[PDB]
Amino acid sequence: KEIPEVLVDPRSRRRYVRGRFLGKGGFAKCFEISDADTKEVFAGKIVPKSLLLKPHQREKMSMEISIHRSLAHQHVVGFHGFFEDNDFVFVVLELCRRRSLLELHKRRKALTEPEARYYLRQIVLGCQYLHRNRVIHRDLKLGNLFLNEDLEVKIGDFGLATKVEYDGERKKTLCGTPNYIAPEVLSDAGHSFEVDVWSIGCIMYTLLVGKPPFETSCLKETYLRIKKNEYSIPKHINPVAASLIQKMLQTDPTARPTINELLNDEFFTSGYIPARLPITCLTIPPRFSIAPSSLDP
């Protein structure tokens, strides 16, 4: 079933011209799209209804839209609306012209500590906004941490996200497999907000070390390592960073920092955070003083 060259909203009468193909994942494909009248450019997520027949997939797509449309934050992908033809669901999102932390990681490998700190602070602020609105994302990974023109982080892909109905509620059901499986998800013990802190721990490790903490060549060994909390931080990682990784990557979810305590860690409060990163940082390491000072042009 071919995807229309022009997307028409049956209700609001708005129409979009399908531009550049941006990427695909699971049931979904994503394109650059532009309004006819305003000429404003967005990201168009496009899902065939042929893949939404299995009732677990209908509820997945439904839940993503329900959660995402309720969110508005500087560090969360803007949600502009959704509509549907007889063959497709169309979701209009904020375009992020600098791809994702996944492409950055593939190109650069290990970032400098100030770059890691710059991105992680924004990831933490976004997740703090989610948790305050009782949303667990449950699938934070480099691939759904998008970058706009100015290299601001935008959290997207709410496909596994869930709303906590009361503070204290633990969930078991997932409609898919998260990239970073927290130990309480692997063990099916019930999970809450702490799974997001686990994934941010995995992300922090990956950005600073240049490889994932647990991932091996085979899933059996990966999952045994997560179960037994078997990972190693290289000697070259600065003690304060190493310390914060150890706090987040603990088997006991209750021993992990809350998202509010994460933001207040010595890593963030006492580490150099650049106000901006130059665009060259997508491809080449920037240069920083041993201890930078705001008392210098």
Residues that bind ligand A1JCP (CB under 6 A): 20-26, 28, 30, 43, 45, 77, 93, 95-97, 99, 146, 156-157
* Alpha carbon separation from 92 to 5, 34, 160, 270 (Å, rounded): 15, 10, 19, 39
For tokens 């027949």, the residue is 53
Q: Which is nearer to ligand A1JCP, 8 or 22 (CB)?
A: 22
24 is an annotated ligand-binding site residue: yes
Closest approach of Cβ 226 to Cl ion, in Å? Answer: 8
Catalytic residue among 37, 85, 87, 139: 139
SS3 sequence of 17-36: EEEEEEEEECCEEEEEEEEC
For tokens 């709303």, the residue is 163
Q: Running DSSP on this structure, what letter comes out for residue 257?
A: P
How far apart CA 234 and CA 110 sit, in angstroms, is: 12
285 binds, among Cl ion, ligand A1JCP, a copy of itself, none (CB under 5 to 8 A by kind): a copy of itself
How far apart CA 112 and CA 285 sit, in angstroms, is: 7
Note whether 147 and 57 are within 8 A (CB). Answer: no
Closest approach of Cβ 158 to a copy of itself, in Å? Answer: 16
219 binds, among a copy of itself, Cl ion, ligand A1JCP, none (CB under 5 to 8 A by kind): a copy of itself
Note whether 61 and 52 are within 8 A (CB). Answer: yes
215 binds, among a copy of itself, Cl ion, ligand A1JCP, none (CB under 5 to 8 A by kind): Cl ion
Which spans of this chain sit near a copy of itself (rule: CB under 8 A)? 26, 53-56, 107, 110, 150, 172, 174-177, 181, 185-186, 188, 219-220, 223, 235-236, 276, 278-280, 282-287
Binding-site residues from annotation for ATP:
22-30, 45, 94, 141-144, 157
Active-site amino acid positions: 139
